[PDB]
Protein backbone atom coordinates (compact mmCIF):
# COMPACT_ATOMS: atom_id res chain seq x y z
CA UNK A 1 0.00 0.00 0.00
CA UNK A 2 1.91 3.00 -1.31
CA UNK A 3 1.45 6.07 0.90
CA UNK A 4 0.70 9.58 -0.39
CA UNK A 5 1.28 11.69 2.71
CA UNK A 6 0.30 14.97 1.03
CA UNK A 7 -3.17 13.81 -0.01
CA UNK A 8 -3.82 12.35 3.44
CA UNK A 9 -2.73 15.63 5.02
CA UNK A 10 -5.08 17.61 2.77
CA UNK A 11 -8.04 15.31 3.41
CA UNK A 12 -7.48 15.41 7.17
CA UNK A 13 -6.90 19.17 7.26
CA UNK A 14 -9.79 20.49 5.18
CA UNK A 15 -12.91 19.18 7.01
CA UNK A 16 -11.20 19.33 10.40
CA UNK A 17 -10.02 22.90 9.86
CA UNK A 18 -13.48 23.93 8.68
CA UNK A 19 -15.08 22.34 11.75
CA UNK A 20 -12.59 23.98 14.11
CA UNK A 21 -13.16 27.40 12.57
CA UNK A 22 -16.92 26.79 12.60
CA UNK A 23 -17.40 27.49 16.32
CA UNK A 24 -16.00 30.12 18.66
CA UNK A 25 -15.61 28.04 21.83
CA UNK A 26 -12.89 25.80 20.39
CA UNK A 27 -11.04 28.80 18.95
CA UNK A 28 -11.15 30.58 22.31
CA UNK A 29 -9.77 27.43 23.93
CA UNK A 30 -6.97 27.34 21.35
CA UNK A 31 -6.02 31.02 21.61
CA UNK A 32 -6.10 31.21 25.41
CA UNK A 33 -2.51 32.43 25.72
CA UNK A 34 -2.69 35.11 23.02
CA UNK A 35 -3.53 38.73 23.70
CA UNK A 36 -7.04 40.13 23.43
CA UNK A 37 -6.40 42.18 20.29
CA UNK A 38 -5.04 39.53 17.91
CA UNK A 39 -7.39 36.87 19.28
CA UNK A 40 -10.50 38.97 18.71
CA UNK A 41 -9.31 40.21 15.31
CA UNK A 42 -8.75 36.66 14.07
CA UNK A 43 -12.11 35.58 15.50
CA UNK A 44 -13.84 38.47 13.73
CA UNK A 45 -12.12 37.77 10.42
CA UNK A 46 -12.19 33.98 10.09
CA UNK A 47 -14.15 32.42 12.95
CA UNK A 48 -17.86 31.67 12.91
CA UNK A 49 -20.29 30.07 10.49
CA UNK A 50 -21.05 33.41 8.80
CA UNK A 51 -17.41 34.45 8.42
CA UNK A 52 -16.88 36.60 5.34
CA UNK A 53 -13.15 35.92 5.08
CA UNK A 54 -12.00 32.34 4.58
CA UNK A 55 -8.75 30.38 4.68
CA UNK A 56 -7.57 27.99 1.98
CA UNK A 57 -5.10 25.13 1.57
CA UNK A 58 -3.31 23.74 -1.47
CA UNK A 59 -0.08 22.42 -2.86
CA UNK A 60 2.90 24.44 -4.04
CA UNK A 61 3.55 25.89 -7.48
CA UNK A 62 -0.07 26.64 -8.46
CA UNK A 63 -0.28 28.28 -11.88
CA UNK A 64 -3.14 30.48 -10.65
CA UNK A 65 -2.99 33.33 -8.17
CA UNK A 66 -3.36 32.14 -4.58
CA UNK A 67 -4.96 34.08 -1.75
CA UNK A 68 -2.32 35.49 0.61
CA UNK A 69 -4.61 36.76 3.36
CA UNK A 70 -4.46 33.35 5.06
CA UNK A 71 -3.42 30.12 3.37
CA UNK A 72 -1.87 26.77 4.27
CA UNK A 73 0.91 25.79 1.85
CA UNK A 74 2.18 22.21 1.55
CA UNK A 75 5.27 20.79 -0.13
CA UNK A 76 6.47 17.23 -0.15
CA UNK A 77 10.00 17.37 1.22
CA UNK A 78 12.60 14.66 1.67
CA UNK A 79 12.38 10.99 2.59
CA UNK A 80 14.61 8.22 3.87
CA UNK A 81 14.59 4.48 4.50
CA UNK A 82 15.24 3.66 8.16
CA UNK A 83 14.44 0.01 8.96
CA UNK A 84 14.01 -3.31 7.17
CA UNK A 85 12.93 -6.86 7.96
CA UNK A 86 14.37 -10.18 6.83
CA UNK A 87 13.57 -10.72 3.17
CA UNK A 88 11.69 -7.40 3.30
CA UNK A 89 8.81 -9.37 4.84
CA UNK A 90 6.29 -7.26 6.75
CA UNK A 91 3.26 -9.51 7.22
CA UNK A 92 1.40 -12.53 5.86
CA UNK A 93 -2.28 -12.57 4.93
CA UNK A 94 -4.66 -15.35 3.91
CA UNK A 95 -7.39 -13.02 2.60
CA UNK A 96 -6.83 -9.81 0.67
CA UNK A 97 -7.75 -6.82 2.83
CA UNK A 98 -8.16 -3.14 2.00
CA UNK A 99 -8.60 -0.15 4.29
CA UNK A 100 -9.87 -0.27 7.86
CA UNK A 101 -13.39 1.17 8.13
CA UNK A 102 -15.47 2.44 11.04
CA UNK A 103 -19.26 2.25 10.62
CA UNK A 104 -22.19 2.91 12.93
CA UNK A 105 -24.83 0.17 12.80
CA UNK A 106 -27.97 -0.26 14.90
CA UNK A 107 -28.72 -3.78 16.12
CA UNK A 108 -31.38 -5.81 14.30
CA UNK A 109 -33.44 -8.88 15.25
CA UNK A 110 -33.14 -12.15 13.35
CA UNK A 111 -35.08 -15.30 14.18
CA UNK A 112 -32.10 -16.88 15.97
CA UNK A 113 -29.58 -14.02 16.30
CA UNK A 114 -29.17 -10.33 16.88
CA UNK A 115 -27.18 -8.89 13.97
CA UNK A 116 -25.51 -5.75 12.67
CA UNK A 117 -25.50 -4.88 8.97
CA UNK A 118 -22.55 -3.13 7.31
CA UNK A 119 -21.93 -1.36 4.01
CA UNK A 120 -19.38 -3.85 2.65
CA UNK A 121 -18.26 -7.42 3.42
CA UNK A 122 -15.93 -8.24 6.31
CA UNK A 123 -12.42 -9.59 6.06
CA UNK A 124 -11.75 -9.28 9.78
CA UNK A 125 -13.62 -7.84 12.77
CA UNK A 126 -11.36 -5.84 15.08
CA UNK A 127 -13.75 -4.42 17.67
CA UNK A 128 -17.40 -3.84 18.53
CA UNK A 129 -17.90 -0.86 20.82
CA UNK A 130 -18.40 -1.75 24.50
CA UNK A 131 -18.87 -5.48 23.80
CA UNK A 132 -16.79 -8.54 24.73
CA UNK A 133 -18.62 -11.51 23.24
CA UNK A 134 -18.40 -14.74 25.23
CA UNK A 135 -18.60 -18.33 23.98
CA UNK A 136 -22.33 -18.41 24.78
CA UNK A 137 -22.97 -15.56 22.34
CA UNK A 138 -21.04 -17.47 19.63
CA UNK A 139 -19.91 -14.47 17.60
CA UNK A 140 -20.01 -15.25 13.88
CA UNK A 141 -19.37 -13.14 10.77
CA UNK A 142 -21.11 -14.15 7.52
CA UNK A 143 -20.06 -11.75 4.78
CA UNK A 144 -21.77 -8.39 5.25
CA UNK A 145 -23.22 -9.02 8.71
CA UNK A 146 -22.10 -10.07 12.19
CA UNK A 147 -24.37 -11.99 14.53
CA UNK A 148 -24.80 -13.25 18.10
CA UNK A 149 -27.33 -15.34 20.02
CA UNK A 150 -30.81 -13.83 20.34
CA UNK A 151 -32.23 -15.32 23.53
CA UNK A 152 -29.98 -14.28 26.43
CA UNK A 153 -29.29 -10.84 24.89
CA UNK A 154 -32.90 -9.95 24.00
CA UNK A 155 -32.77 -6.77 26.14
CA UNK A 156 -30.46 -5.15 23.55
CA UNK A 157 -32.65 -5.55 20.45
CA UNK A 158 -31.93 -1.98 19.25
CA UNK A 159 -28.41 -1.39 20.59
CA UNK A 160 -27.04 1.73 18.89
CA UNK A 161 -23.60 0.19 18.37
CA UNK A 162 -20.71 1.13 16.10
CA UNK A 163 -18.18 -1.17 14.43
CA UNK A 164 -14.49 -1.04 13.51
CA UNK A 165 -13.85 -3.58 10.75
CA UNK A 166 -11.82 -4.30 7.61
CA UNK A 167 -12.92 -4.59 4.00
CA UNK A 168 -12.73 -7.88 2.10
CA UNK A 169 -11.30 -7.88 -1.43
CA UNK A 170 -10.45 -11.45 -2.48
CA UNK A 171 -10.05 -14.95 -1.06
CA UNK A 172 -6.49 -15.25 -2.40
CA UNK A 173 -3.44 -15.33 -0.14
CA UNK A 174 0.01 -13.85 -0.47
CA UNK A 175 2.98 -12.18 1.19
CA UNK A 176 3.57 -8.54 2.08
CA UNK A 177 6.96 -7.29 0.88
CA UNK A 178 8.18 -3.82 1.73
CA UNK A 179 10.08 -1.63 4.16
CA UNK A 180 9.65 1.38 6.44
CA UNK A 181 10.23 4.93 5.20
CA UNK A 182 10.93 7.99 7.36
CA UNK A 183 9.45 10.97 5.50
CA UNK A 184 9.51 14.72 6.08
CA UNK A 185 6.76 17.05 4.83
CA UNK A 186 6.83 20.84 5.09
CA UNK A 187 3.80 22.98 5.92
CA UNK A 188 3.81 26.78 6.08
CA UNK A 189 1.12 29.39 6.68
CA UNK A 190 1.12 32.57 4.61
CA UNK A 191 -0.25 36.00 5.49
CA UNK A 192 0.74 39.60 4.90
CA UNK A 193 -0.29 40.15 8.55
CA UNK A 194 2.15 38.49 10.95
CA UNK A 195 -0.37 38.09 13.78
CA UNK A 196 -2.70 36.17 11.48
CA UNK A 197 0.24 33.92 10.63
CA UNK A 198 0.93 33.28 14.32
CA UNK A 199 -2.69 32.37 15.03
CA UNK A 200 -2.79 30.20 11.91
CA UNK A 201 0.31 28.34 13.11
CA UNK A 202 -1.31 27.75 16.50
CA UNK A 203 -4.43 26.36 14.84
CA UNK A 204 -2.23 24.12 12.70
CA UNK A 205 -0.51 22.79 15.81
CA UNK A 206 -3.85 22.05 17.46
CA UNK A 207 -5.20 20.14 14.47
CA UNK A 208 -1.96 18.14 14.29
CA UNK A 209 -2.50 17.26 17.95
CA UNK A 210 -6.09 16.25 17.24
CA UNK A 211 -5.10 14.08 14.27
CA UNK A 212 -3.19 11.61 16.47
CA UNK A 213 -6.48 9.90 17.37
CA UNK A 214 -7.28 9.30 13.69
CA UNK A 215 -7.53 5.68 12.58
CA UNK A 216 -5.37 6.02 9.48
CA UNK A 217 -2.26 7.55 11.05
CA UNK A 218 -2.74 5.31 14.08
CA UNK A 219 -2.43 2.38 11.65
CA UNK A 220 -0.16 3.83 8.94
CA UNK A 221 1.69 7.03 9.92
CA UNK A 222 2.95 6.48 13.46
CA UNK A 223 5.76 8.45 15.13
CA UNK A 224 4.77 12.01 14.34
CA UNK A 225 7.42 14.66 15.01
CA UNK A 226 7.23 18.42 14.53
CA UNK A 227 9.74 21.20 13.92
CA UNK A 228 9.14 24.93 13.47
CA UNK A 229 11.17 27.49 11.57
CA UNK A 230 11.61 31.19 12.16
CA UNK A 231 9.18 33.88 11.07
CA UNK A 232 10.70 35.19 7.85
CA UNK A 233 9.61 37.47 4.99
CA UNK A 234 8.68 35.04 2.25
CA UNK A 235 8.62 37.79 -0.40
CA UNK A 236 9.94 41.36 -0.44
CA UNK A 237 9.31 42.34 -4.08
CA UNK A 238 5.62 43.07 -3.57
CA UNK A 239 4.13 46.28 -2.24
CA UNK A 240 4.02 44.50 1.13
CA UNK A 241 5.88 41.50 2.50
CA UNK A 242 4.53 37.99 2.88
CA UNK A 243 5.24 36.53 6.32
CA UNK A 244 5.24 32.82 7.08
CA UNK A 245 6.68 30.33 9.56
CA UNK A 246 7.47 26.95 7.95
CA UNK A 247 6.80 23.79 9.93
CA UNK A 248 8.26 20.36 9.22
CA UNK A 249 6.21 17.24 9.95
CA UNK A 250 7.78 13.78 10.10
CA UNK A 251 6.06 10.42 9.70
CA UNK A 252 6.92 6.73 9.53
CA UNK A 253 5.04 4.52 7.09
CA UNK A 254 5.42 1.06 5.57
CA UNK A 255 5.64 1.04 1.79
CA UNK A 256 4.63 -2.48 0.81
CA UNK A 257 3.30 -4.65 -2.00
CA UNK A 258 1.19 -7.81 -1.86
CA UNK A 259 2.83 -10.81 -3.56
CA UNK A 260 0.22 -13.45 -4.32
CA UNK A 261 0.81 -17.20 -4.03
CA UNK A 262 -0.85 -19.79 -6.27
CA UNK A 263 0.52 -22.85 -4.43
CA UNK A 264 -2.15 -24.72 -2.45
CA UNK A 265 -1.57 -28.23 -1.10
CA UNK A 266 -4.58 -30.54 -0.80
CA UNK A 267 -3.22 -34.10 -1.16
CA UNK A 268 -0.38 -36.25 0.15
CA UNK A 269 1.54 -39.09 -1.53
CA UNK A 270 3.30 -40.96 1.30
CA UNK A 271 4.80 -44.07 -0.33
CA UNK A 272 7.72 -46.30 0.65
CA UNK A 273 10.64 -47.52 -1.46
CA UNK A 274 12.11 -50.96 -2.16
CA UNK A 275 15.55 -52.22 -3.14
Amino acid sequence: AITSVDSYLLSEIKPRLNTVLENCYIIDEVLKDFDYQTRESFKEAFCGKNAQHEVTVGFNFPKFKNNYEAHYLIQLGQGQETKNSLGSIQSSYFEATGDTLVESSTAIREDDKLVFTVSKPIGELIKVEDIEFAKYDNLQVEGNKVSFKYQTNEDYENYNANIIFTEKKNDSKGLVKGFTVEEQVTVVGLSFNVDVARCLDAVLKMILISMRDSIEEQQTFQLQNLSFGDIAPIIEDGDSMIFGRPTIIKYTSSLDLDYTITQDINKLTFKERKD
Binding site: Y68, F192, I235, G238, D239, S240, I242
Partner: peptide, 25 residues
Protein backbone atom coordinates in the same frame (compact mmCIF):
# COMPACT_ATOMS: atom_id res chain seq x y z
CA UNK B 1 4.51 49.88 -7.39
CA UNK B 2 1.40 47.91 -8.35
CA UNK B 3 -1.21 46.70 -5.83
CA UNK B 4 -1.50 42.91 -6.14
CA UNK B 5 -0.77 41.33 -2.76
CA UNK B 6 -3.32 43.57 -0.99
CA UNK B 7 -6.23 45.18 -2.85
CA UNK B 8 -8.49 47.97 -1.62
CA UNK B 9 -11.54 49.29 -3.43
CA UNK B 10 -11.53 52.56 -5.35
CA UNK B 11 -11.73 55.59 -3.02
CA UNK B 12 -15.15 57.07 -2.25
CA UNK B 13 -14.95 60.42 -4.02
CA UNK B 14 -17.56 63.09 -3.33
CA UNK B 15 -19.64 63.58 -6.46
CA UNK B 16 -20.82 66.86 -7.96
CA UNK B 17 -24.39 67.46 -9.10
CA UNK B 18 -23.29 69.21 -12.30
CA UNK B 19 -24.52 67.15 -15.24
CA UNK B 20 -21.73 66.30 -17.67
CA UNK B 21 -22.12 67.61 -21.23
CA UNK B 22 -24.77 70.10 -20.17
CA UNK B 23 -26.44 72.41 -22.67
CA UNK B 24 -26.43 76.13 -21.84
CA UNK B 25 -28.54 78.94 -23.28
Amino acid sequence: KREDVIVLQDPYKVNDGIEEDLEIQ
